Symmetry: D3
Subunit: 146 residues, 6 copies
Amino acid sequence: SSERTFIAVKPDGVQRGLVGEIIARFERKGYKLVALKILQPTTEQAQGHYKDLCSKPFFPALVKYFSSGPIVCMVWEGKNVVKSGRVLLGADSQPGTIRGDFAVDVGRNVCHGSDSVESAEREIAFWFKADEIASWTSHSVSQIYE
Amino acid sequence: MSSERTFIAVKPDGVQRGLVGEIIARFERKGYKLVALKILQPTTEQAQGHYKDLCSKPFFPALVKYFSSGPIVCMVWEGKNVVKSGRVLLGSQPGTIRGDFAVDVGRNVCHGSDSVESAEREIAFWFKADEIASWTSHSVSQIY
Amino acid sequence: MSSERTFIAVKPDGVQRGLVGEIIARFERKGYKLVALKILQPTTEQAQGHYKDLCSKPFFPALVKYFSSGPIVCMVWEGKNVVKSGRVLLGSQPGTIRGDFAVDVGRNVCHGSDSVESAEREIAFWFKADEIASWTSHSVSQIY
Amino acid sequence: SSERTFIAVKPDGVQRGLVGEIIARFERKGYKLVALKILQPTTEQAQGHYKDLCSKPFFPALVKYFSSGPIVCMVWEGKNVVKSGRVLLGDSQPGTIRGDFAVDVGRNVCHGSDSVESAEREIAFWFKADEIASWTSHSVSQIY
Amino acid sequence: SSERTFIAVKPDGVQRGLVGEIIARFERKGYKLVALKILQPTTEQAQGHYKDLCSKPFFPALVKYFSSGPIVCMVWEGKNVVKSGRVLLGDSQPGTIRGDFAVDVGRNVCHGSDSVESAEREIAFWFKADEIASWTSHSVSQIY
Amino acid sequence: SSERTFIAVKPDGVQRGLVGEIIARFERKGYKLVALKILQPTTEQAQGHYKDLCSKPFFPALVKYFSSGPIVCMVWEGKNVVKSGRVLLGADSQPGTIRGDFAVDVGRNVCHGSDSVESAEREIAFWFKADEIASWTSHSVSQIYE
């Protein structure tokens, strides 16, 4: 209902000019944008985001890639937005999805979306302050929802 | 076989959100032929009759004037395996209409006939014979 | 003022080339409201009557059954300055319908009313009152 | 140079789901996104933004509309970004943002700085230095 | 690696104006165009192209159709270009080329190599070494 | 009627992946593709194409830019195709046109089209052999033409 998910355009996605395309696909799907910003992660921000991988191999490489350039951070609100968000991104990813259309390699997969409600609020709280999150009314809300 | 027809309707939410042209465009690019088209706000009786098969369900009244709460766009498309292709185009995974544009089952933007059986019914229900234009498109030998 | 209406028709070449959905989509995205819609193959008399003002020109017969040579899609759109906006959308420089899709004046894909005067005529000609759906879209206070 | 312009999607544009489309058109043009955020302006912010128009009779309406809902604030960097930004927005012609999506001047979907002067003002008003990303596009020698 | 696949727009795809759309989808995916040409295959060329299917009863029809009009021959370079090419073409699902534009298997708009093996065969058959461009995309380290 | 024009995607246009977009816009306009190829111009090809500028300043720079990477050569056939081609490309170029949508600088204007029937056949004969030009029937020809 008031469910939220975190979406980020990775540096390859920003550099290739795919920011607008991604935002548009979420909008046309009927979801509500409530937070948005662009920034180049510091080493520690990159580390924190990928903290779960601190025991995983090549973590420094991941950290220095993610911090090598600007990302676009988003929060989207709506029913099943976490699940639909992953679906919109894709995986073997299929055309019609973001990765299906624009990405070839896993290391260059354009974008990230939270894999769960668990993960989303963690990622959201990490990247955004409460005041950065807009609260507003979609005029189309009951044409999208029952 | 290329005389097969399917019924497609853009639901009030689909009309409201301006997705009529997009949907029509997706059928045209697929290579199908438009033979009937109209917009109307369904009456209660039209809404009931269309959903005649659901008249015993508890959500029938809710479904009935949602459907008559605003305009729908009615279409008939003609071509080989158009009934199935219609369902495929609707979706749900991205690339399809519902996959691209819809979130809720009660708000799934669009409807398509689920079978040739249903297709003949729905078309006959919403359109009279004189409303169905029959014509031959010049790309027929490029598509089929 | 937001009750202004214009008449738009996709010509047989436009239908033939699958540009109906695209054209409808361009009007929707502009923020205009679809209130009437139908497809038909014009009869000779319908073609003559529509082009009544051109009945004294040497190319009238040629123009008349080209127009009845195949199906057209008839539309009515409602909204502020829609007559003018319709002409603007049609075009010719790129970004407009004729600018994007057309090469020949005799094959200019689409027609729009050139004035409010003409608009009332064309709509009344092609559509009866019961065919015009009147409804209020939820984005009306976002567009106007 | 590293010229910058301020672009804001007004509340109707956000509500109508036009943010991504607009961002895309700037990206496709080859300009560089260096700042981005979404917020609902306070009355005080809207007045400050429209400072130059405070003696105009339609100033109050501008203030209530701009503060009536969320906007998306952007800064774009590149040669002629101020002028090209204005050109992209668009008496607007199809192909442009207002040409494609807007009908009335009070709901013209989007705003861009009218000058470099206005740009630095607008940028300084809406963004702190810390919010502006500095980076180099890999495509820079393909664009300039 | 510098893996290559052969892509051909079949005569219906060319006739239906789908060449640019297809080329675009490969470009948007991040693959590199290294060879490109348009020609109408001779009967002898079509037979050679469909060499592996010469024992199939629908082989003759394939030969006459493929030689019935102009095709666009392409070579694309990049990692998994053979598989991704097949995935992009598409029981085909919307979002794919055949899913979006084709209805029947005999007029499925486009062809892609089914394997690296087939790719080198197809490439060597249709193109001379002199026709293949060698170049580096500036976006290569953004894609791979 | 059987008028032809020469269209080339410049190296910036190829590199930015705008080849398909340009071809599509000509196709949707209703014009007929009759010749197509991709190549990186040699110095002499670049020189010959810009021969009219041999007395013009900075000619070597133009020559080494044009020969610095691959271009896509096209020939399109149809009524007023030379004039319509320039219109589709644009100039101060307006949105809806190729340059209006994708180009910022004159030195990076994505694409070239012949400025006259004069120029078109010169450019065509220069870049294409007779056998490279396909002769074929658009099935939509009389839906486009009277």
